[PDB]
Design an enzyme around this catalytic site. Structure first.
Site, PDB file in Angstrom:
ATOM      1  N   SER B  62       0.780  -1.236   0.000  1.00  0.00           N
ATOM      2  CA  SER B  62       0.000   0.000   0.000  1.00  0.00           C
ATOM      3  C   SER B  62       0.826   1.308   0.000  1.00  0.00           C
ATOM      4  CB  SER B  62      -1.031  -0.006   1.122  1.00  0.00           C
ATOM      5  OG  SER B  62      -0.385   0.065   2.373  1.00  0.00           O
ATOM      6  N   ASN B  74       3.196  -5.030 -14.509  1.00  0.00           N
ATOM      7  CA  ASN B  74       2.369  -6.239 -14.793  1.00  0.00           C
ATOM      8  C   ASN B  74       1.078  -6.342 -13.998  1.00  0.00           C
ATOM      9  OD1 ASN B  74       3.419  -6.992 -12.399  1.00  0.00           O
ATOM     10  ND2 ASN B  74       4.430  -8.854 -13.101  1.00  0.00           N
ATOM     11  N   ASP B  80       4.308 -19.296 -10.876  1.00  0.00           N
ATOM     12  CA  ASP B  80       3.787 -20.673 -10.862  1.00  0.00           C
ATOM     13  C   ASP B  80       4.695 -21.598  -9.990  1.00  0.00           C
ATOM     14  OD1 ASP B  80       1.863 -22.731 -11.913  1.00  0.00           O
ATOM     15  OD2 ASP B  80       3.727 -23.560 -12.751  1.00  0.00           O
ATOM     16  N   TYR B  83       8.281 -22.506 -11.259  1.00  0.00           N
ATOM     17  CA  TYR B  83       9.340 -21.510 -11.227  1.00  0.00           C
ATOM     18  C   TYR B  83      10.143 -21.682  -9.895  1.00  0.00           C
ATOM     19  CZ  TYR B  83      11.753 -17.042 -12.247  1.00  0.00           C
ATOM     20  OH  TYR B  83      12.677 -16.034 -12.459  1.00  0.00           O
ATOM     21  N   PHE B  91      11.602 -10.728  -9.309  1.00  0.00           N
ATOM     22  CA  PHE B  91      11.811  -9.309  -9.677  1.00  0.00           C
ATOM     23  C   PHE B  91      10.515  -8.550  -9.607  1.00  0.00           C
ATOM     24  CE2 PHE B  91      16.126  -9.545 -11.296  1.00  0.00           C
ATOM     25  CZ  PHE B  91      16.213 -10.963 -11.478  1.00  0.00           C
TER      26      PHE B  91
END
Lengths: 124, 128, 126
Positions: B62, B74, B80, B83, B91
């Site tokens: 926040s 993004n 997932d 990974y 990142f």
């Protein structure tokens, strides 16, 4: 299952499994490339073990020209105090005027993540 | 259930905890300077093996915009369970709306895990 | 469970391991100037399973590839948006001049169960 909701004052538009629309608590003007925390005029007691997620409405950019700087806001069950009012963090990509009662974002509740152990390893 | 966490190096702030249940804060792995209207992939200094059948969601804290003047390009990162390799570091993709400096150890985003969606079969139809 | 999917036309690239988010593609070429906006058609309409919704976010490579952010952060598509003309779009604001080609993967979605029915009860204090 209940949510208890307190409004800032009697002028606030009262709320309607769909996501629930939240509205500006006062008229707010934001210049291009400036930021304002837009009050939403509600404070809530969420059900135990839940959190709320807040995103813009699909129509917010077209209507108002703002984006939500935190992407998605997370409100924990603990944020249940009398003065724990919610706000929408607005960054204006154009000069804009938002009016009291205009719908600007939406929320739902979700069960909190179950307890997990974070364990350090040297190698995955 | 457990998440296994590997830190990039010895200077990363640890977040090791037993019984962690609320969103978990992630930190800049090094000092980064970003000039207004530029972009930087901010390393977070952590790699993880998530519980089987789960994914992670990553959003700004926040206070990230107030403190550091950045947005996450993004919107929400989806990490997932696959990974999970030894160089699968995380990142924060930062776009700066003002000149800013983020310092090693600054809390800039947060994550939780979510069960992945059910198996779904997409059936093509000519009308709905 | 089943998602019934209708494409806008034969030219759309048809859309996946269990549980992975599903990539959605540009329905037409779209050019956007820096600091401008365009609703990018995705060329798909769907009947989501009863009691579910869809959440749509950019792919992780969307910004690097195409210089755009998704102005509504995360799109939410309710089960009721299941009509024959209920097509999906990605609301793109360009931070640099950009070109998206028909068939480019630009966002991704998953389904999630909708929240439980809950009573919203007004109180005078907390």
């Amino acid at each position: 299952m209940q949510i208890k909701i307190k409004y800032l004052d009697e002028t606030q538009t009262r709320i309607n499994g769909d996501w629930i629309d939240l509205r500006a608590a006062e008229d707010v003007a934001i210049k291009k490339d400036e930021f304002k925390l837009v009050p939403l005029g509600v404070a809530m007691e969420l059900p135990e073990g839940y959190e709320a997620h807040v995103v813009p409405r699909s129509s917010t950019y077209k209507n108002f020209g703002v984006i939500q700087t935190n992407s998605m806001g997370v409100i924990d069950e603990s944020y249940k105090g009398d003065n724990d009012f919610w706000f929408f963090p607005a960054y204006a990509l154009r000069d804009t005027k938002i009016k009291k009662g205009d719908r600007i974002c939406q929320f739902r509740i979700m069960k909190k993540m179950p307890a997990v152990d974070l364990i350090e390893v040297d190698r995955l």
